[PDB]
Motif scaffolding. Sequence first.
Motif, PDB file in Angstrom:
ATOM      1  N   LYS A  73       0.754  -1.245   0.000  1.00 46.13           N
ATOM      2  CA  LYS A  73       0.000   0.000   0.000  1.00 46.13           C
ATOM      3  C   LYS A  73       0.789   1.302   0.000  1.00 46.13           C
TER       4      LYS A  73
ATOM      5  N   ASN B  79       0.133   5.623  -0.449  1.00 51.75           N
ATOM      6  CA  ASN B  79      -0.847   6.691  -0.458  1.00 51.75           C
ATOM      7  C   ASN B  79      -2.055   6.580   0.458  1.00 51.75           C
ATOM      8  N   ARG B  80      -2.144   5.529   1.261  1.00 56.39           N
ATOM      9  CA  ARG B  80      -3.289   5.407   2.155  1.00 56.39           C
ATOM     10  C   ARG B  80      -2.959   4.917   3.549  1.00 56.39           C
ATOM     11  N   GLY B  81      -3.502   5.595   4.545  1.00 55.06           N
ATOM     12  CA  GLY B  81      -3.292   5.205   5.919  1.00 55.06           C
ATOM     13  C   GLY B  81      -3.907   3.882   6.334  1.00 55.06           C
ATOM     14  N   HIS B  82      -5.125   3.605   5.879  1.00 53.46           N
ATOM     15  CA  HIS B  82      -5.815   2.389   6.295  1.00 53.46           C
ATOM     16  C   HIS B  82      -6.352   1.456   5.209  1.00 53.46           C
ATOM     17  N   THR B  83      -6.386   0.164   5.527  1.00 53.86           N
ATOM     18  CA  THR B  83      -6.874  -0.869   4.618  1.00 53.86           C
ATOM     19  C   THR B  83      -7.689  -1.940   5.356  1.00 53.86           C
ATOM     20  N   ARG B  84      -8.572  -2.627   4.636  1.00 52.92           N
ATOM     21  CA  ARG B  84      -9.428  -3.683   5.201  1.00 52.92           C
ATOM     22  C   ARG B  84      -8.726  -5.016   5.535  1.00 52.92           C
TER      23      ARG B  84
ATOM     24  N   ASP C 126      -3.919  -5.695   1.985  1.00 54.31           N
ATOM     25  CA  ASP C 126      -2.728  -5.300   1.245  1.00 54.31           C
ATOM     26  C   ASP C 126      -1.591  -6.305   1.366  1.00 54.31           C
TER      27      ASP C 126
END
Lengths: 128, 100, 217, 204, 118, 87
Positions: free
Chosen positions: B11, B13-18, B32
């Motif tokens: 990942k 560009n993004r702080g959080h993922t599922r 990720d």
Amino acid sequence: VRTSVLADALKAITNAERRGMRQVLIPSSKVIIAFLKVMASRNYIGDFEVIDDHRSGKIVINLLGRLNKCVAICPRFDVGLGDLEMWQAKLLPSRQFGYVVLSTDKGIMDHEEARKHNAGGKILGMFF
Amino acid sequence: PVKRRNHGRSKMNRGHTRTVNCMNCGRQVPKDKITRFAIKNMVDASSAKDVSDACIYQGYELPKTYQKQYYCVSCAVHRHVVRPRNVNVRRNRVPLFLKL
Amino acid sequence: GGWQPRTKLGRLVKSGKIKSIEEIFYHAIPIKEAEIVEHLLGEDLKDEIMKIMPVQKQTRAGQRTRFKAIAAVGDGKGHIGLGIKTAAEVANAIKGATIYAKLSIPVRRGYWGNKIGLPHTVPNTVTGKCGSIRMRLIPAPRGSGIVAGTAAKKLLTMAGFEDLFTSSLGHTKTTFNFLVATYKAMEETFKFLTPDQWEDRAFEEHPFVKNSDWLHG
Amino acid sequence: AVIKMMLAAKVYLGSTNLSFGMKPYVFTCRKDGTHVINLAMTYEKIKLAARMIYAVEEPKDVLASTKSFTRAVHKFAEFLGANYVEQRFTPGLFTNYSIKNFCEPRLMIVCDPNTDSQAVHEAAYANIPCIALCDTDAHLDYVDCVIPCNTKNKNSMGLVMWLLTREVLRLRGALTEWSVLPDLFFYRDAADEAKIAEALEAEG
Amino acid sequence: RIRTKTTKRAARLVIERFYGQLSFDFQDNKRVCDAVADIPSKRMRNKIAGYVTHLMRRLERGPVRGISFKLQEQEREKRDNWMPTTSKLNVPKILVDPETKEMLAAIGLGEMEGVEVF
Amino acid sequence: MQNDAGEIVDMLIPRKCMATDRLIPPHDHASVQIQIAKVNDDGLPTGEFETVVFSGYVRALGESDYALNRIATEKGLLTGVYRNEAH
RNA sequence: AAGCUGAGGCGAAGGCGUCUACCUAGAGGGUUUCUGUCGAUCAAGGGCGAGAGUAGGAGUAUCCAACAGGAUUAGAGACCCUGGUAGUUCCUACCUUAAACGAUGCCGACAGGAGUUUGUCAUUUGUUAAUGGCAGAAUCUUUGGAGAAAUCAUAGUUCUUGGGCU
């Protein structure tokens, strides 16, 4: 923000000379034009073109390939003749070449000029 | 030191993922960070010719099961889906198959 | 019968076709034999073991110890070389490191204040950095003597500078670095472009293409 | 006076994705993906390559084709009496005197620097100038004087090496059509040869 | 039962020099390698001759790598030297693609008498 | 470098690169010294060469190709080649 | 709120995935609109701030600190198994911490190639495409320099030492 120009522009000229380019593109000014003029007298540089754009300006240098660093030190420290020969020993590498561009009352000129005219002032940087 | 530029995370560009789950541990892991799309035949192979005698409807196409599989590093290594490898060929970001 | 030259360069020297070290340096040719440098400076140059050090590879049987060693070649007129070498024996290390110095060998010089006679110091301050160590050689007025560490001073004297100033940085106990960063400083003396080496002279004839018929027929 | 674009634009215009150093030598990128090598500059640069090849001694000069497309490099050697290496390079050739075939040249000339980095990079340890018959998809570091070309098809390398040999012979004398055609400078497959084995006994 | 580096490197050096002798048969070549090369033992020559036979029925076929036996060196030179009649480079019309014609405009050599497009 | 009463001092002068204009030190073995045969009109050699030099910096980048185009056309050993055209 | 879902997008960071209508903010692009230096960074001071936690209501399906059994073990307050309340969800007040991690402070300039990709414009009928422009997001490399090394187009331009603030 552009804190200084004469500081900034002499970095870009040095990055050309390390790399060994033929010409460089500098926003222009009236101290940067004089700083380039004084090192043109001692033949460190070629010959340059201060172009118009109804704006700040640009300069196109033509590099001769004979130049190692342009510094421009700041803040602009006052210096007075008796005090000056410390600032040669610190700033330059050698004794036997390299000059210290300072804006004397008469104008901006090397240390070698400035001691001849008997006028100190604030210092801009050096070259060698 | 840093083992991977990635950090094992894909990942940017993004702080959080599922999160998902390895099928075996049942462990909660971010999406990720080891997926396989998995097509297996529903009958088998050696079973299939015994079946196709007794089929109503002639010829027929015996269907395929589909499954998206999520593992996790601990589960993935134990099953030999992934293994460790040499420091130079870690960078190698393509799978084993190769084409001309 | 003495050494038999191997390769093109040794062949010229045995022949005597080329005289002096400068011809070789100007043309930037690899010196791949110590029997060359023995011949050209064959008088003044001296071996000097700078130090030995013990070094220990672990193995299934405990500790295969080997001896790392430096030597340093030094003609008192403005040349220097430095080499390092490991071996199991101490004598093979030293007689190795003597050869490695010769393989690698001109130190530029200049005046402090005014041009007087016969230069005695580095033309401009230069720094050579190896690993952690940083070495700075500074212009210095006449009759000051050299000042550095006694590791650096021995090498510097061989270089021939009459007086010098110095400013070490980093982890200067590690002597194989400290001596190398001194050697690398004197390498940088010719790199630095002054006002004096402006102009273009005519390019000298490269000494293979000049003598390309004594070599063959 | 003189027109060998007939000869050149027979076989080779072709290419793949181009390097930054090779962007002057190439013309228009063609539709498909292929690029068009410029025949103006390829002939003109071979004229300079001959002059450079005009070393004091032909044997000292080294012309060394790890790519198969290796017959043309042999012939260049025979006509110009220039040394060459069949098979792999063997590194430590220009350094390392203890190898049997130790040959420091005064310059070398290459098939392709992209397929053969090894001999190109060992030039830089012994002051050797390098000239190269690269196509577009080619790293240009450590190499002077590019001959813009194709290296992929069998015919393209042959045409240049023949043409390079010819321009050198005109300079040095002993040549004023000399009877050696560019048929002789081609790579030949065993299949290509199979018919050559027939044609020898067909004469008898 | 592998043949070692010494008996291979002998057996290649035998076929280098004496391909004018030798055959497909073992019992002949065994008796050759006594006379050709001074060998200490009996077992050595049986293993040398055993590879010399092996290479012969490889040589009845395409040319083996890392070996050169003087008859093929002569034969390669004839096969090398000759070059067929005609250039083979003249179509002589010479087909050329549409963009590559516009290149031959830009050089300044259109109306070449070499044909265009399709 | 000069002794100033008179004379010239120092031993050896490093040759200068024609592309970049920096000094060529003792140990940069990637440095190159070419010879190119100048020729009479109608292609006759005159027994008189031009010796082009490059430093190991310029070869390392890639650019020593493009200098040979520029330097030779300045001296008058080529036509075309330098300056245009792509497309 | 599966699959679509990716070294893809947006958001100051924390974070944000079914569809429909509703109110709301803004980055990037284009601009021969307007103003004219209005700006950079920041002690105090002010807000936002995962998950856990607290107080009071409304819920309570799943999963589940504690707890209760069952196994295993020398013992097992654990790992494995069967049940389980607080919590997990919504609303109103709080708390103000994380490996809150690119373990890389913010604004500004310059220094190298290569092909990816997101948004949008430009010249072309290669128009869901080709080449080029700004702004993102990553990557590769036989490039230079840096570093103790791992490595890094920034961690480069630094004993050849000084663009501005914390």
